[PDB]
Structures are given as C-alpha cells and as structure tokens.
Amino acid sequence: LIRKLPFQRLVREIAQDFKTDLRFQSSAVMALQEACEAYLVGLFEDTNLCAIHAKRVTIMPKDIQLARRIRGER
Amino acid sequence: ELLIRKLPFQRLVREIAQDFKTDLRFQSSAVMALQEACEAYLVGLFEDTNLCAIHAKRVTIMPKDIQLARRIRGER
Amino acid sequence: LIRKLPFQRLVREIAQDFKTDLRFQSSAVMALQEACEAYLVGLFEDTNLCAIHAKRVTIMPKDIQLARRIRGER
Amino acid sequence: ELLIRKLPFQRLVREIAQDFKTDLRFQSSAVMALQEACEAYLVGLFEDTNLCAIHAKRVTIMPKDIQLARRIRGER
Amino acid sequence: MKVITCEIAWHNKEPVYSLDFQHGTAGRIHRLASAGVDTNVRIWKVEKGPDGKAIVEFLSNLARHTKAVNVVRFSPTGEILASGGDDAVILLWKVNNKENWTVVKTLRGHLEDVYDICWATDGNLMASASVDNTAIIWDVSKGQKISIFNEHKSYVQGVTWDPLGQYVATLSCDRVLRVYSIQKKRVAFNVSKMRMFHDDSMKSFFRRLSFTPDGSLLLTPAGCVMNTTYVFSRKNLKRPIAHLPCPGKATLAVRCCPVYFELRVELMSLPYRLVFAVASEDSVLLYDTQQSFPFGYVSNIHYHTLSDISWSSDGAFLAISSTDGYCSFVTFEKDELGIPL
Amino acid sequence: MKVITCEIAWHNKEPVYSLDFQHGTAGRIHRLASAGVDTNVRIWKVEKGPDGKAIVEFLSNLARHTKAVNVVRFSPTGEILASGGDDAVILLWKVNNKENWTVVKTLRGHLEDVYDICWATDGNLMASASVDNTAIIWDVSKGQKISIFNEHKSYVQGVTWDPLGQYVATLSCDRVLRVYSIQKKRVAFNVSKMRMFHDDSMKSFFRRLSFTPDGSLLLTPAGCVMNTTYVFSRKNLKRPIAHLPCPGKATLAVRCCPVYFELRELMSLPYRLVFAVASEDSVLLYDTQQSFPFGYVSNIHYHTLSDISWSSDGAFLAISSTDGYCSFVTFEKDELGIPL
Amino acid sequence: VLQPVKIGCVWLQQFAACFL
Amino acid sequence: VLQPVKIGCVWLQQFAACFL
Amino acid sequence: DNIQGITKPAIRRLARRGGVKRISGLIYEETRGVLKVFLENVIRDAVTYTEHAKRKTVTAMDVVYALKRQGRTL
Amino acid sequence: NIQGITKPAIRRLARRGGVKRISGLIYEETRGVLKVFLENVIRDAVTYTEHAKRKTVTAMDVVYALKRQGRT
Amino acid sequence: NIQGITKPAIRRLARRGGVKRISGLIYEETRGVLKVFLENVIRDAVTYTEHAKRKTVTAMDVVYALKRQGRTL
Amino acid sequence: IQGITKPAIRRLARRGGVKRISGLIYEETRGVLKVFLENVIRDAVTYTEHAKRKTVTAMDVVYALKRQGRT
DNA sequence: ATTGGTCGTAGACAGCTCTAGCACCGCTTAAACGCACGTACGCGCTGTCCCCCGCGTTTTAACCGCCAAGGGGATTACTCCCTAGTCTCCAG
DNA sequence: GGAGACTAGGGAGTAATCCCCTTGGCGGTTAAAACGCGGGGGACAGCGCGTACGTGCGTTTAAGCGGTGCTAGAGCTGTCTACGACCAATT
C-alpha cells in the first residue's frame, strides 16, 4: 500500500528513460502496483525470516544482499 | 565430475520404482544423465546454504539454515 | 489459441444478455480468451483424470459432472 | 455433534504440538475447533470418494479413489 | 402492552438477521418473514391469541439461497419479497410449507453480504446496501440495475428510501453518512463530524436507519456525542436537531410504525405524531414524535445481540429478532399507542 | 588450397555459435572473434604461417555477457564489435588477455537468443534478428531504437542489410522471407511459395542469408525443391532466377568475400565474386560466373557447422561448428582470382 | 443466567432526552 | 574412425549444376 | 446462437492437448454448456469489478481478480 | 500419536459419510490426509498467534484460518 | 522522483511485512531494489507489448513478467 | 535410500567449500534430494506416457530442466 | 468403578478383477465451404490531460529513553587423522 | 578377485554458545505542510469497431471398420456379520 501518485510518477520517470512519449493506462498502472507490492511483501517477509535467523531483532541490509544472492539476484 | 557410486543410486531408483510400479526398466545413459543433474542440483543448493551460513557469521553449518533456504525456494 | 470471432460473439451476446450500452477492450477480450482457455483445459485434464480412474479411455458426461460436483462450483 | 473420541483427539493434537514446540497449553475451545475442522473436511472427503466410487460402478471403495480426489485437489 | 419471547428455535438455533411484516396486510393477521444462517427464509403467520399474546404459525420455507441471508424485505404493497444475503443475490419472491413462493427477477450485481434493502413507495425502484462499498438502484419491472453509488468507503450496513422520492439515505461502517438525490444521482449531503457515529468496534452487522414515514425527518442510530440516535430534517441534513441518548450498548435499528397517530420537546410540528421503535444491542426503546423521553422500554429478553425489528401493518405487532436464534414480539391492545388518523 | 582444423577447444569444449573477422584489417594479419556457450567472446589473431597453414593466436576474452552468445559482428570499419546472445543484450565493444575491449552502447530491447546481426555499410545502422519474432533498427551514434519489424511469426534466424541501403532481407524459421524497404519502414515483398524453405526439422539454429557485396543478388540458404540455395535479384525478388542444389544436409550460411575478383553466369557484370556456403556437415565454394562449385570440403567437423567468415583480403575462410572445434580455409596469393 | 427486569408504562429518567 | 576423402582443384560430377 | 461456435475439430485438438486420444461426439454439447455456464460465473464478478472503478468498459485486470475469487489465478 | 483416531471411529464416520462397503487400508491413508490437512492449519494458527502475541491458540484464530483456506 | 518511496510508507509496508525494528539505510536500499527490479520487469513487459504491436503496456505483460521472475500472482 | 553414503556427502561438502559440518546434515540432504528426484521422475513419466513409452530417456530430464528452470 | 469403547477372531459371499464376448462409432480421408484473418479507414469515443484549489493527513526533524549488536570469556562439543576391517564396484 | 572406500571409532580443539555490559541508533511525540487525493473541463490528439476483401487452411459429412465401450460369468477374496476378550475413560 504505497501512496498512489508518488509511485505512479516514479514509474513514469523510470519509464521515460528507455524512450520518451510513453503512455500507460491505469489498468497496467495498478497491475504494476500489484507486482511491486507483491515483490516487496515477499522480500520483506523473507528478510524478517533471515533476520530472526540472524538472531537479531533489528533488520540489517546484509540480510537483504543474502536474500538476493540466494534468490538469484546477483 | 562423478563422485557418487552408480549402484546405490540405481538400487534406490529401483526401490522407488518397485514402490510405484514394477517392470520399469532404466537405461544406463538416462540413469547417468539424471544422476549428474542430481549432483549438480544438490551441490547448487549446497553452496547456496554455504553462503547462507557465511551471512550467519558462523563457519560451522546447521541445517535449520538450509530449511530457511527451502522456504526461500518455497519447495515445501 | 482456440479461435477469436465466435468467442467475441459469445462474450458480446452474453454482455447484451446482462446489459446493453457497454464496451470491451481488445486486450481485455483476448485476456478473457486465454482465461477461458486455461479454465476449460484444466477441467479437461480433470476429465482425463477421472476417465483414467474410470479405467476407460473414451469419456461420458458423468466424468465432467464429477469434475464440477467434486469441486462443487455448481 | 461429534463422534471421534474427544480426549484421544486432544491427546493426538497435543502430541503433535510437542513434536514441534514443547509445552503448548490447549483449551477446550481450541480442541473443539480442531475437531469441527476435522469432521467437516473428512465428511466432505468421504462424500467426494463415495460419489467417485459410484462413478466407478463399484460398491466397494478403495484408496485409488482418495488418491484420485487428492490429485484433483492440488495438495501434492 | 405485553411482550412475548419466542423460545423455540426458528432456524434450528442459528442466529436470525432480519424480520419483516407483510405491508400488504390490512386486517388483524400479519405475515412475518425471517432470515437466518440456515440459508432459508421462513415466512410465518403472526396473529393475536384470545388472551392478546402473539401467536406464530409457520407458513413457508425459502431455501433457494445457497448461503446465509441477512436482510429480507416486503414490498409496500406486500406483493414481492426481497431477500439477499451471503451469496449476494437479491431474490424477488412472489406468491405463486403451507404456502409457496417463487423468485421473479434475479437482481444480481452485488458481491458479498447484503445488509440493508429499502423499498421505494411506488415499489418499482430498489435500494440495496452491501459490504461491497456501493448502493445499486434497480428497476423492479425491468429487473435490471440503473444507477450506482460507490462513494462508500467501508461496510455499508444501512440504507433507506425517501418516502417523498427525492433523496437516498445511507449508513456505512466508516462513521460517514451519504445522501444521494434521486434526480441528480450524485451526493447531495455528507456528514462525518459534529466521532459523529460509532466505529467498526460496534458489534452489529447492521446500521439500519429509516426515514420518517412522511419523509420529513431521518432517524440515524449508532451515534456518538456515549451511544445515541441523531435526528435530521429535510430543511437541514448537515446538523442534528436532537439525539436520543442510549447509554450502554449502541443503537442499531430504527423502524417507524406505518400508522399515523393523533397528538395526545416536540421533535417536529405537524398535527399528527408517529411512533417508532429503536433497537440497541440488548435494549429496545419506544419513542413518539411529540415526547422527547421514551414511553416504552423493554430489555433483558434476549441472550445475545438484537438484529432486526419490524412493525405490523396496523401497528399492533412489533417483532424483535436477535442473534441468539430466538425472536420476540411486542403486542399493543386496541389503539394502545394512540388513536389512528 | 589447404584446410586446417582447430583441434583445441576454443571455449572449453562448448559449441561455437559465431565467427567474424575484423573488417578494419587491411594487411596480412586478420583479427577473428568467436562466440560460445561459455558466455565469453574470444578475439583471436589469425595469420598465415611460413608454410601457409593458418595459425591462431589468442588476444582477448569478453565475459561481460551473462548468458550464451549466438552472434558476433564487426563493423565494416572494424571499430565496433557487436555481440548478443541468450541474455539478448547487444554490446558495442570498442578497443580500449593480450588486448582489452569495452562496451560503448547497450542496444537492449531483445528477449532471448539473438542469432543474426548485419552491419550497414555506413556502420551507423544495425539490423537485429532474434527468436523474439522481431527486427529492430538502431542508431549506433544514438544507441537507441528507431524502427521495429515484428511481422515475423517464427524464429528469426537470418538477416542482412542491403549494401545499397534500400531494403532489408530477413529470414525467419517459418520458411518465409520478408523484405523491408528502408525508407518506407514497411514490408516491401513477401515470398513463401515457389515449401520453398526448410521447416523446423533443419537442425541449425541459424538461417543467415547475406546480400551480394554489391547488393545486386541475394543468396538464401536452407531451401527446398530437396535442400538447395535459391538466388534472387533486385529486379525481381518474387521469383528466384536459379538454385544451387546441395544434396545431403541443408545449407545454413551464406558469406561472400569482400574482394572483387576479375573474370577468369548468375549476374552479368565485369567482375565476379566468390562466396562461401556452409551446410550442416559440408561446405561448397562457388563463384559468380561458374554455376558449378569450384571447391568443396567435407568430413572435417564432427558436428553441425554454425558460422563461416571471409578475411578482409579473402585469404582466410574461417569455419565454425557445434562440436567446440573450428577450422579455416587458406588460399595462396590470389588463388581465388585476380583482385580488381 | 439472566435476571429479567421489566418496567411498565409510566407516563426511565436515566434516559431522559437532552436537547441542543 | 572417419576416413577423409579430399578432392583437389579439378577445373565432383555428382554435384553438377541443374537449371530450370 | 453463437454457442455452437466451438466446433468439433477445435474441441478434438484441445482434447489432444488435454491428454486424451479417443473422445465421443456426444461431449461437444456438454463442453459448450460447461463453457457457457462458467463464463457466466466469471463474467458476473468481472462486470462487478468493472463497475467498481466507475468503468463502462471491462478491463483485463478484472478477470484476474475473478480467478482469484475462483481460486485459479494466472 | 496419530493412532488417537480409532478404526471403529473411522468406520462410523465413514458410515455417516454415505459409504457401505469399505476396505481396510483406508483406515491408514485417512490419517495421512488428516495430518496433511492439519499441519497447514496449525502453522497458520501459529503465525496469527505470533502476530497477535497470544501464546494460546483461540477459536477465532482457527475460524479465520479456515476462512483463509476457504472452508469456514 | 526516486525519493518517492516515502520513509513512513516504507515503515508501514514493513509493518505489513511483519518487520520489528527499522533503520535508516533501509529507507533507500528499498529504493534501489524497487528501481532495479522495476527496470527489469518493465523491460521485458515493454518487449512483450512490442510483440503485440501495441504502444501501451498491459497487465498481460506484467503477469508474464512475473512468471519469468517466478512470482506469479 | 540409504545408498547416498555420508562420506560422499562430506567430500561433496569439501568441494562445496565448507569447513565444519554438523552431523545431522545427512538426513535432510537425502530428503530434499529425493523430493526433487520424485518431481523430476514425475515430470519424466508425464512426458513419457504422452510419448507412449515405458523407459526413461534424456529428453525427459531435459524437459524437467526446462520446466523447473534450471537449464 | 464401571462402562461404554474397542479389538481381534471365523467364514459367506458380494463384488473387483480377469477373461471371454460384441457391436458400434472414433479415425481417415475427399471434397465442399466459410469465416478467419488481415488493413483501411472512416466513424465513434473512450481515457485524458493537469491545475489548482480545497484542504488536509501524513512527512519530516528533532528528543529522549532505552533495547539491542556486538564484544569478551568461559564451556563444552565434535571431526581430526589415522587405524582397521570390510565390502563391494568394477575390472578382468 | 582384489583394491579403493566406508564404516566404527579415540582427541581435542577450534568452533559454537551463552552471559555482561554497552552505548548509539532506533521506537514513539510533537507541528505543519506538502505533497496526496480529486475533479473538471478541452477537445486535441490517442484509442478501438464494423465492415469490406479475399482466400485458404481450418471446418463439415461421410465412409468404415475396427479399437474400445458394454455384458456374463466367474471366482476367489476381505469384510461384517457376533463376539469374547481387553481396555482407555469420567468422575
């Protein structure tokens, strides 16, 4: 549940990078919102998993890069 | 390369086959191909867990970390 | 992947059956297309699953009536 | 409205609990919730299997039916 | 008056959600319909006995609904029965089990639990309130939806149709009331701050408010100043004239008797007074137009939360339903409330 | 002539997918680049030995690609190296391991295996062909996409740029040739029937056809009559003038030497051009004037051939196969003919 | 159990309405 | 093993040209 | 009468994809019946979601939530 | 452990499940079905209890779980 | 622009993720992860919509991107 | 199933770059070995029955690689 | 304490499975056909822009307590590193 | 048959493991503001739709017969009939 329009013009600016004059319909907008929210909740959940795994309550980025390397990110 | 003996793998394959259904012949080429894919996958998850333990800042490994990796994969 | 014009006729006819003065998107129409495709093919693997348990190759309606009653959508 | 012997059910679910986490206290309400889920799902499953067996034309029921239904279910 | 409690389970001990009397009745015997978790709509025959106590007689069972039913409504003429619930299907039953009923039109378009239904005076236009954050206007003769009101941001638990046929009053779980003019089909008024009503913590699935039978005033239960019931007017819908204090449990139901009583602080000034019933979670308060304080109060008659109340055609019966699976009635003698016009 | 087969694995015993010589070379030593499954692009140094046999010298390794690489292309000036593959990223390498290379522009926009790349004569325009059923036109200086040709309905395994800069010749796996006019940016011609080309049963991942260096004629491999190579002309692209029969396996590659040779006839001009055609397990060497092939080499590779390449002077003819081994064809001084 | 307390018709003061 | 057969410069008849 | 738009060879080759070899002709009519009833089912929820966005035009996102309700997301 | 359910109980529950003729090995696959079913439910109950920081498993927890897999 | 991933918005999304305690540097490494994976997914999405000869991306492209990234939902 | 010898596990571990290994490693390694063995053989026989064949073939494991995405 | 719940035995036969029997309607072309598909293109029109104003809930900064990540050290525990039979995989 | 390997087994010792600050960065608090939500034309320029086009490979009928559904008779077996013993269970 990110705030709508800040996210939408994040998407707009990062879409303009490939080539300008790109129009996106609201349908695909909420679709990509669904995609981003699903990914972030999944990654956050797995970070909590590996964090209590790390036997520290507070979150650490090292957990994040760990998850990336296991999830095939880099 | 190969570091797992052919006969134990073949006999467990025949065990599960006769558990499922008899008269299922296994060819040597298919058996060795499946075995090498087996070793590749298992070693892949193995160093996956190795890196997990490296983050776990404890050089010795304990399998609950491996089970974290499992639910990362979502296999079970 | 099945066919296009008769299914568009189907969806338009059922739409006017619901209510007139409505419009469909082409992309949405084809999306409905693969959606119905997937649902029917899944039902049909269920059909095969029953018939194999029915230890007969050829299929009679009671297979698909099981499919539906067993999952109970109707 | 229950037929499974309630305290054997309680001991079963308790023994399952301490197989994973030790010293889990259960009250009557939790036990009856587990029950109601139990008989509900099993009666649905047997309804399924009986009608499938009727499709099978065979009066007797054997677990090829229940395996059939579960391979429908997607649980495996 | 006398109060008689139904100690026999109407729907096999399942909670009752709604009650409605046949508005088409014109004599002493009245027809009452009930809705429960058992996916059945039971119409009963309610009539006074020799001693004046209410007597309940079972007439028909309506099991077409696949899931539970939360609201049941009769037409102002009594011809068509409206019934919708968990399966989110609105059925227009008709007299074709001592008797039988058949669904005329399937007014589908809702998604989940439908909580409040109101019949328009003409009987040809429908207001439906459901959890789905919307109110849909339907055509009874056409059997098709014609208008949509999606301004609700929470569970819609109460709606009523203006008897004058000008506005539409809605109550939702968001402590926000929305008024829709029947001509423009847009929001005419909106009140949220005086909070103004009770939040989601209130334990009743219904927020049923109803207009005054003449439409001059609107009675909105489940208010907060403590629990209260605010009153609005057609002159100004953005400010309450007064509120009825009901400390303790929150009011959830407002029903007005369709019989105009003569005059025997005054909420509204016309030569006639109207007696209405307000049902809280465990208490029922009976007011009239002219008196600020209630002239009747019944409590400690049901073991769980009350769900719905209904007035009879002549006002001699006041059915009360609760969530414990049991219902109750309030019986008034000949013109006990007052002398009808 | 002499044929020398490289018996040392170039990419650690993995199949070789492409080969290309440095078009910027102008002397005796030529620079060759290779593509393999090892996600690495190896540029080699190829030069004749004292006896005339080909000698291969390793120069650089290009491991930036995350996945397999299918096609490697040099610019006509030889400055910029084009490389794309399974990761579907078109890298414009530049000379910055004996030597080093650096990617200039990232011409991304493709999805999976990119099979055929053709440089325009000016070198500022790219034609990109991949499994993704599309052909994308790019600007080298801009590094951005400018035109799209996605009318293909199957694996786009062959494309070449018109040397005259008028049309675009594309070969897809659907046995259909598509000609795209360069000014209209639409389809110019469509030929599918005399089927004419080979179906999916042909085992080569490539359908690389190339125009004649003058652009007058177009040579398309992987045809049917039986396996053959049809010849088209600018005058009429809807009917082949003739076909070169190749019984056995289907032809997969067409490459023409960039050196014009004197006449010692498919097309009637005072010069003749020698081109190389690679089948699955055989190579036939033709010339412009003689219908029959003047050279034929076979039984030198244990698996299917993948790519061939002529040298800048025509003295080297590299051959790549899918067995991890490559081979070269060496001609003596002007053995093919007298250069113009 | 519950203890029923019923108040008859008295022509209570805890619920006297307060105006605004 | 493979038996290489190589044909030198002959200025093969199995691959003679065929026209239409 | 577009219901008959789903033909004998089309259903036969869907069957081929399904995992059957022999199927009787008496299954085509029940196939169109199951197709029509469940397109009814899915499009009901689809049009509800469409009305939710104050839309007079259906969108491809609607069928997604429709299958989520039906438990067959894709 | 899993033997908390008795074979006669299995038989009577099957009998009111509408079946008349039954084989033996059903008494053992039914236990596997039951454990496979209940593991997910109890896992979700543990998750919800940790979310609410209630050590004891409540009725409403199980009810909302059954709502999650859809057999309320 | 890029800082549009609001800090307390990150906080509440972590809340829904069951996160206990949150540090500052997360509030922009989340921006990094978001930007890179959206770059990837809208990349193959615009490719998929280019296959359709369509100048606007669709939810179909998004869902196929999720299949290719193994997070189908 | 016992055939996966524990010293083989340990030498494959030594190849994997680990240094000190807990003893209880072996049983769960074998278990998740056989779960994927089961998945692959299930997909193999799924393709094989459509092929109307009874013998395992390398094409089956290649399609298993394609399906699971490990290619 | 007793008390209903359970368990395990003995065989009659009801019925699942196997074999034998039978017919009949899916493959399998050959020929008629038709709508499926592809583009234009004029016509409809739907999504829209985007600004500001309205206006208002959340964002951001900083404080202050204080919970916890990590260091230190004592504590146990577990593969060395052979030692040795073995045993069986594989070659002859 | 015979030679690498593994399985059974001590040593301690390095590697986890839990305790003890410990402080510093982090969890709620506050004020407002600042973008967040929204809606309204504007019709301009983007968008699909229907139909025409044609024409060609998918669609339709049918022979036709035989691989596959349908019926008879086993026929041999594992319940569920009654029961006699244990036997966990509520209080």
mmCIF file of N, CA, C and O in Angstrom, chain E residues 241 243 245 292-293 295 297 299-300, chain G residues 4-5 7 9 15-18 20:
data_model
loop_
_atom_site.group_PDB
_atom_site.id
_atom_site.type_symbol
_atom_site.label_atom_id
_atom_site.label_comp_id
_atom_site.label_asym_id
_atom_site.label_seq_id
_atom_site.Cartn_x
_atom_site.Cartn_y
_atom_site.Cartn_z
ATOM 1 N N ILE E 241 -31.008 18.109 14.812
ATOM 2 C CA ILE E 241 -31.879 18.867 15.705
ATOM 3 C C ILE E 241 -31.742 18.358 17.133
ATOM 4 O O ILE E 241 -31.641 19.141 18.085
ATOM 5 N N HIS E 243 -30.640 14.394 19.522
ATOM 6 C CA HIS E 243 -30.222 13.000 19.540
ATOM 7 C C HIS E 243 -30.847 12.305 20.740
ATOM 8 O O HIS E 243 -31.040 12.921 21.793
ATOM 9 N N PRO E 245 -30.551 9.861 23.715
ATOM 10 C CA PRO E 245 -29.487 9.215 24.494
ATOM 11 C C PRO E 245 -29.824 7.761 24.799
ATOM 12 O O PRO E 245 -30.897 7.451 25.320
ATOM 13 N N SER E 292 -40.051 13.868 23.991
ATOM 14 C CA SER E 292 -38.613 13.641 23.923
ATOM 15 C C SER E 292 -38.231 12.330 24.601
ATOM 16 O O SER E 292 -37.461 11.535 24.049
ATOM 17 N N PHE E 293 -38.767 12.079 25.803
ATOM 18 C CA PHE E 293 -38.461 10.856 26.530
ATOM 19 C C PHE E 293 -39.249 9.675 25.960
ATOM 20 O O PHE E 293 -40.340 9.855 25.412
ATOM 21 N N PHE E 295 -41.679 6.462 25.877
ATOM 22 C CA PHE E 295 -42.818 5.958 26.634
ATOM 23 C C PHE E 295 -42.804 4.442 26.791
ATOM 24 O O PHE E 295 -43.708 3.895 27.430
ATOM 25 N N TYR E 297 -39.948 0.818 27.056
ATOM 26 C CA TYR E 297 -38.582 0.314 27.127
ATOM 27 C C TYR E 297 -38.613 -1.133 27.592
ATOM 28 O O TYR E 297 -39.122 -1.425 28.679
ATOM 29 N N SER E 299 -36.090 -4.678 27.915
ATOM 30 C CA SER E 299 -34.711 -5.141 27.922
ATOM 31 C C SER E 299 -34.635 -6.481 28.642
ATOM 32 O O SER E 299 -35.597 -6.929 29.271
ATOM 33 N N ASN E 300 -33.466 -7.116 28.536
ATOM 34 C CA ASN E 300 -33.193 -8.406 29.173
ATOM 35 C C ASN E 300 -34.198 -9.470 28.737
ATOM 36 O O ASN E 300 -34.717 -10.234 29.552
ATOM 37 N N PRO G 4 -34.507 -11.051 34.608
ATOM 38 C CA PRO G 4 -35.321 -10.084 33.857
ATOM 39 C C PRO G 4 -35.838 -8.970 34.755
ATOM 40 O O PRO G 4 -36.417 -9.221 35.815
ATOM 41 N N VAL G 5 -35.622 -7.732 34.320
ATOM 42 C CA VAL G 5 -36.154 -6.545 34.980
ATOM 43 C C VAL G 5 -37.000 -5.809 33.952
ATOM 44 O O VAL G 5 -36.475 -5.309 32.949
ATOM 45 N N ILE G 7 -39.958 -2.825 33.170
ATOM 46 C CA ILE G 7 -40.570 -1.584 33.630
ATOM 47 C C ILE G 7 -41.823 -1.339 32.803
ATOM 48 O O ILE G 7 -41.770 -1.348 31.568
ATOM 49 N N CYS G 9 -45.541 0.770 31.739
ATOM 50 C CA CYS G 9 -45.838 2.066 31.134
ATOM 51 C C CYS G 9 -46.005 3.107 32.234
ATOM 52 O O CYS G 9 -47.001 3.115 32.961
ATOM 53 N N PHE G 15 -32.856 7.884 30.961
ATOM 54 C CA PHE G 15 -32.873 8.022 29.509
ATOM 55 C C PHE G 15 -33.609 9.280 29.064
ATOM 56 O O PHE G 15 -34.026 9.370 27.903
ATOM 57 N N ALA G 16 -33.793 10.246 29.962
ATOM 58 C CA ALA G 16 -34.460 11.485 29.589
ATOM 59 C C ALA G 16 -33.648 12.224 28.533
ATOM 60 O O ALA G 16 -32.438 12.420 28.677
ATOM 61 N N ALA G 17 -34.328 12.637 27.467
ATOM 62 C CA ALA G 17 -33.649 13.253 26.334
ATOM 63 C C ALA G 17 -33.146 14.645 26.691
ATOM 64 O O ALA G 17 -33.828 15.411 27.380
ATOM 65 N N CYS G 18 -31.950 14.970 26.213
ATOM 66 C CA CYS G 18 -31.344 16.282 26.401
ATOM 67 C C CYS G 18 -31.208 16.947 25.037
ATOM 68 O O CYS G 18 -30.680 16.343 24.098
ATOM 69 N N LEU G 20 -30.215 20.229 22.290
ATOM 70 C CA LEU G 20 -29.058 21.062 21.983
ATOM 71 C C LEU G 20 -29.492 22.384 21.361
ATOM 72 O O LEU G 20 -29.836 22.443 20.180
#
